């Protein structure tokens with residue numbers, strides 16, 4: 249009906265479908281001011297309750313409308329290390345803007361809170377700079393950070409500011425995590441990631457790139473030569489369904505496809521030396537953000553037909569709703585309640601087809617809230633020359649075993665205190681997907697914040713969870 | 717200053733037409749390297765990640781050996797690199813180390829460049845006190861040469877050229893000509909997938925089991941994507957984490973051969989490069 253969000257510049261679907269430039273272009277200042285005036289400044293501010301780290305949302309929006317952008321950035325920065333990221337990638341539809349009261353008005357949309365966080369962060373990022381430092385020579389203790397994702401970057405940043413020696417160890421050649429090899433450029437521009445890394449680098453943090461912990465440097469070395477250790481290795485194995493035809497040429501994990509496309513930039517081939525297989529008709533299994541970004545990455549390679557194949561319905565799709573629509577706008581087709589059975593290959597080796605069925609709801613909760621059961625005679629085949637499986641990911645099973653006394657959870661993730669981040673091993677902390685499983689950037693950020701604070705508290709002698 | 721830098725190419729030596737041998741300065745990688753392991757490298761910023769084996773290490777001086785065959789762009793560019801040049805990315809040591817004990821009489825079989833991979837295993841087996849019989853095959857004779865100074869110094873060597881010293885042709889024929897003498901329960905195959913397939917197909921044997929060093933397509937090399945996917949026995953293994961060395965009997969050879977040809981369009985980046 250009435251109060252909807254303020255429109256922002258976006259790439260046209262037909263033009264952006266073949267290139268990797270960012271789709272959401274970002275608010276102009278006047279647009280940000282227009283959106284900011286929509287905030288009712290609720291004294292009870294339920295919006296804050298919708299935020300995983302409970303950012304002072306009406307505060308930074310208010311300082312924005314008051315033309316005080318400097319204070320707005322600092323308000324955000326007190327709560328969130330990576331606001332230029334979360335403004336872009338947060339599923340605001342199920343978090344903060346899901347709790348905005350103006351959305352509770354009759355047929356009205358919530359204040360674009362994610363967009364305003366994005367604006368303030370970007371406005372102060374693209375042009376404005378901060379300061380110099382390092383202050384990380386103040387304290388005596390050395391800390392080893394494993395992984396340069398949202399968690400490791402945040403933890404390292406906070407510990408450096410606190411004065412401790414911080415060594416980040418990264419396996420790949422570019423920092424870090426999902427922000428470089430996971431999420432594509434048309435969602436999260438890498439300039440932002442490189443910027444934050446340089447910012448953390450300017451804080452005095454030492455980056456050990458091309459270093460696989462447990463291999464390049466052994467676990468028991470990290471434990472010997474450091475005062476504290478943060479395990480922020482995230483989770484990506486990945487997981488293969490294991491159905492027949494999995495070993496066929498043209499079948500991909502979303503990990504390999506995206507690592508090639510995002511980190512190795514196979515779409516700029518042959519400028520970049522990393523190749524990728526042709527895909528005129530491609531099927532991506534799953535409806536998560538991983539599946540959605542993969543399919544969207546595939547279409548930009550010259551794909552004629554791109555299909556989403558999902559076991560459940562639309563409403564159950566975990567992907568970011570804006571990005572779901574974006575995928576639709578690019579021409580990607582969605583198949584709900586469909587489960588692949590096998591992959592059919594040719595004599596020369598190549599995926600030509602895929603056997604599938606349809607699904608329905610029967611049992612309550614066998615496994616997963618609406619556990620789906622296949623339907624007989626719904627069995628059909630789909631003609632695809634490329635297949636990307638995005639059904640999930642897992643923790644690093646061998647690496648965790650090299651940590652003596654480290655206790656795992658239900659199925660492989662680290663047992664770690666939610667607030668302190670302290671594990672069963674003295675001085676060792678952890679956070680992000682390596683603890684919670686698949687989750688959000690903002691939560692990985694927050695875990696990095698909390699762990700860093702209690703590493704500080706621990707290294708000062710104040711607090712010690714390891715007694716016996 | 718005036719000295720050695722990270723990932724510096726310390727010594728480069730051209731030992732065959734399209735085969736090049738490198739000694740690279742990497743203290744960490746050289747110190748932490750176990751026999752059977754490998755590294756993944758990237759030459760330039762636009763470059764790609766490719767896996768290459770550690771052929772030897774000198775931790776005290778922090779160097780590691782690698783021998784490369786030129787089959788395409790990246791190996792070519794690495795060969796054109798000169799002494800003093802640096803490789804942009806070097807990650808390792810990756811893969812699972814060889815299983816090294818004091819078994820008995822051991823047979824080793826290797827092809828051209830795979831011999832380099834087969835070398836630190838030999839040394840390690842001889843480091844554990846094994847009595848070795850080594851078989852050396854190559855692309856040619858001294859036009860494309862195989863390293864004699866490695867094996868003959870390390871063990872008793874039978875040379876299996878494609879028409880020169882020792883028997884003439886495929887190395888499986890040299891394993892075949894054990895017959896009268898032979899040995900007790902180990903054989904190793906490192907080379908192109910076809911040769912490793914056949915040395916496995918030695919199945920007649922004397923009832924000797926084969927260790928094989930697989931060479932699938934790799935991206936990260938850390939077990940994060942599954943490009944190096946291999947079916948061992950009936951089950952799926954990752955040769956970068958679970959391998960690269962497996963038991964040849966359990967290795968699915970036809971599917972690996974099929975997967976090594978998965979990208980054949982890669983010849984394009986060789987052509988644009990070969991113009992220059």
Ligand SMILES: Cc1cc2nc3c(=O)[nH]c(=O)nc-3n(C[C@H](O)[C@H](O)[C@H](O)COP(=O)(O)OP(=O)(O)OC[C@H]3O[C@@H](n4cnc5c(N)ncnc54)[C@H](O)[C@@H]3O)c2cc1C
Nearest residue numbers: 337395397399419425426461481482538680681688689692
């Ligand atoms: C395709 C994809 C899309 C996503 N989209 C969204 C979204 O839209 N909105 C949202 O809120 N969340 C999203 N997420 C989730 C979010 O990215 C993660 O929850 C968050 O990044 C977790 O941070 P992390 O540090 O725990 O893991 P990671 O970001 O994966 O950090 C792992 C880092 O540590 C390195 N590392 C791992 N093991 C080692 C080791 N042994 N030695 C050295 N280095 C190591 C890795 O190379 C990597 O650089 C997405 C995730 C994926 C995979």
Ligand SMILES: Cc1cc2nc3c(=O)[nH]c(=O)nc-3n(C[C@H](O)[C@H](O)[C@H](O)COP(=O)(O)OP(=O)(O)OC[C@H]3O[C@@H](n4cnc5c(N)ncnc54)[C@H](O)[C@@H]3O)c2cc1C
Nearest residue numbers: 754767768769783784785787788789790791829931932982
């Ligand atoms: C553990 C492991 C250790 C290895 N050690 C050595 C070694 O010591 N010396 C050596 O010469 N080779 C070695 N290889 C094989 C080597 O990785 C490939 O020859 C390499 O990928 C060649 O790629 P490129 O230089 O041509 O560049 P790319 O552009 O990446 O390769 C494309 C071209 O190279 C051809 N090619 C041949 N093999 C491969 C391959 N595995 N992957 C992709 N393309 C391939 C392709 O047909 C194509 O023409 C090893 C492989 C593994 C898995």
Ligand SMILES: NC(=O)c1ccc[n+]([C@@H]2O[C@H](COP(=O)([O-])OP(=O)(O)OC[C@H]3O[C@@H](n4cnc5c(N)ncnc54)[C@H](O)[C@@H]3O)[C@@H](O)[C@H]2O)c1
Nearest residue numbers: 827828829830853854855886887907908910911929930931
């Ligand atoms: N698997 C590994 O660990 C590893 C390590 C390095 C190189 N390689 C491989 O080396 C290969 C290139 O080989 P090359 O150029 O040195 O020479 P090549 O292809 O001619 O093989 C060298 C020798 O292998 C022996 N051989 C026996 N049967 C064979 C057969 N049926 N087919 C081929 N060879 C047979 C022969 O003696 C031949 O001389 C590459 O494809 C590279 O992948 C593998």
Ligand code: SF4
Nearest residue numbers: 287288290295348349
């Ligand atoms: S709820 Fe919507 S309106 Fe009320 S404060 Fe948070 S943002 Fe401003």
Ligand code: SF4
Nearest residue numbers: 299334338344362365
């Ligand atoms: S962090 Fe994610 S959730 Fe918390 S505010 Fe910024 S956007 Fe809304």
Ligand code: FES
Nearest residue numbers: 935937941942956
């Ligand atoms: S190289 Fe990607 S998982 Fe082994």
